[PDB]
């Protein structure tokens, strides 16, 4: 048993829910936050925008550092830095950015980072501000994602339209 409540059960793993990532965050204090970041942990906006800002930029301040020692991570890859007050730990997944023009098929390897974790709280990657298709990016968690996760979707009328399509 866990604290995650008010989610719909899509498969044996996965759980969604129309909430915003931080709030649901503040309230479980999960032991995993997904941020969707960039690969220069540049957190201005979206989910990592609004995860930085209720951290009060400490995740800015952590990020800068981890980048000076060890560069740019790679667009589908990951790191776990601190989760600040939100969670014991965020890991910042780098899903492509179709408005930079990433490979798609990049999102099976982003995805696969969440099956380190026994269970996160997580948004959609590559949706919202990072151009792809929400339907898709779900239906590569399914299929990709063995871990339990609690998906978080900001956007009311995208979670019932989630959910009425999912096969
Ligand atoms: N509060 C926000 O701006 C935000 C954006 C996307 C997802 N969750 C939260």
Do not use: W
Request: charged share 20%; with cysteine.
């Amino acid at each position: 048993v866990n604290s995650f409540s008010g989610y719909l059960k899509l498969t044996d793993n996965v759980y969604i829910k129309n909430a915003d990532i931080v709030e649901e965050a503040k309230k479980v204090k999960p032991t995993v936050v997904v941020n969707a970041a960039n690969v220069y942990l540049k957190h201005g906006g979206g989910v990592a925008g609004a995860l930085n800002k209720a951290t009060n930029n400490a995740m800015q301040v952590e990020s800068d550092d981890y980048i000076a020692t060890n560069g740019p991570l790679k667009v589908g890859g990951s790191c776990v830095l601190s989760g600040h007050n939100l969670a014991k730990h965020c890991l910042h997944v780098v899903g492509p950015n179709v408005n930079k023009g990433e490979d798609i098929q990049l999102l099976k390897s982003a995805y696969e980072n969440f099956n380190q974790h026994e269970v996160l709280l997580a948004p959609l990657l590559s949706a919202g501000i990072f151009g792809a298709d929400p339907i898709h990016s779900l239906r590569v968690c399914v299929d990709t994602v063995r871990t339990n996760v609690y998906l978080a979707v900001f956007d009311k009328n995208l979670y019932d339209k989630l959910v009425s399509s999912f096969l």
